Design a protein around this ligand. Structure first.
Ligand SMILES: OC[C@H]1O[C@@H](O[C@H]2[C@H](O)[C@H](O)[C@H](O)O[C@@H]2CO)[C@@H](O)[C@@H](O)[C@@H]1O
Length: 309
């Protein structure tokens, strides 16, 4: 696997967003400012709670199929390769890592089989879209920590995706959970959300390396990044962390991440988190405390590193 110079796009999208000129302008700027060669198109269906069984990919929160295909085609017209990442959020705000059901099927209770039926039907539809648009890679799940123990069901889902899509298939585990997944043999690429502290890369990379060596598969950090916020460099996954604006802390985080991972031949790339569809005005970048790097010192750090690889 070539080194993946990637950037996540579309997380903020809602139905209709991908029809707009400003979505195209934002993607053009993502490529120009970062020298990314892959875009990770990250989308989120909705379910009501962490313990309900219906996965909705048709409502106002989700781009329509026609505009999604339009955006994917436009990305390819720019020379980008495309990784499609359809995941799921909860309407009550619970992180999807907590999605979970009783081990047993209890009368009148929601079951694992019910949830997986709805989630499989969701994944198969977007796998067909990934096939039609020739996406380079497809991500069947994201940070589903408590669901990862249902090995048999994840294998069933992956086999369903294989019937619809001929490209590379991966699953995105959460930080520290790279060994929690036992179905890596059924996938083409291992990936995780590499939200590791600025001062702990050595221990975490050594741990992941040993996991990755157990399988014969390439690896990359399909999500990674850090807000421009004081304190974020120690807990970069924490999107709701409280702290003052700090552009330099974000740049320092990226500098260390790239320096530490560059010497690991098995770290095969990044899907940096994240580049918004409705991008803030560049004049507001020095006051933006979010993950975005547009107009911030980390933008130049990323572009320089991607151009070196
Ligand atoms: O899921 C809604 C929340 O997403 C947050 O971004 C997370 C994302 O869920 C996923 O965990 C990814 O790997 O890291 C992102 C940054 O931590 C935020 O966008 C937040 O506003 C959202 O409600």
């Amino acid at each position: 696997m070539e080194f993946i110079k990637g950037f996540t796009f579309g997380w903020d999208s809602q139905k209709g967003y991908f029809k707009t000129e400003r979505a195209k302008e934002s993607l053009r700027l993502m490529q120009e400012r970062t020298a990314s060669e892959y875009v990770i198109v990250a989308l989120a269906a909705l379910q009501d709670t962490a313990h309900s069984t219906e996965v909705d990919f048709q409502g106002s929160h989700m781009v329509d199929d026609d505009e999604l295909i339009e955006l994917i085609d436009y990305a390819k017209s720019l020379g980008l390769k495309v990784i499609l990442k359809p995941t799921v959020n909860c309407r009550n705000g619970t992180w999807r890592a907590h999605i979970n059901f009783f081990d047993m099927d209890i009368p009148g209770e929601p079951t694992w089989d019910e949830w997986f039926e709805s989630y499989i039907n969701y994944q198969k539809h977007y796998a067909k879209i990934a096939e039609k648009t020739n996406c380079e890679m497809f991500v069947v799940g994201c940070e589903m920590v408590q669901a990862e123990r249902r090995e048999d069901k994840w294998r069933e889902l992956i086999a369903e995706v294989r019937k619809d899509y001929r490209g590379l298939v991966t699953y995105n585990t959460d930080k520290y959970q790279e060994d929690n997944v036992k179905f890596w043999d059924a996938l083409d690429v291992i990936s995780s959300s590499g939200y590791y502290p600025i001062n702990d890369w050595d221990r975490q990379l050594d741990r992941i390396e040993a996991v990755v060596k157990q399988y014969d598969k390439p690896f990359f950090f399909v999500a990674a990044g850090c807000p421009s916020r004081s304190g974020s460099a120690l807990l970069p996954n924490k999107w709701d962390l409280e702290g003052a604006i700090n552009l330099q802390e974000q740049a320092d985080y990226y500098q260390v991440m790239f320096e530490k991972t560059a010497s690991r031949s098995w770290v095969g790339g990044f899907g940096l988190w994240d580049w918004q569809t409705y991008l803030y005005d560049e004049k507001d970048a020095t006051k933006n405390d979010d993950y975005g790097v547009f107009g911030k010192p980390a933008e130049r750090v990323i572009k320089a590193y991607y151009q070196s690889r």
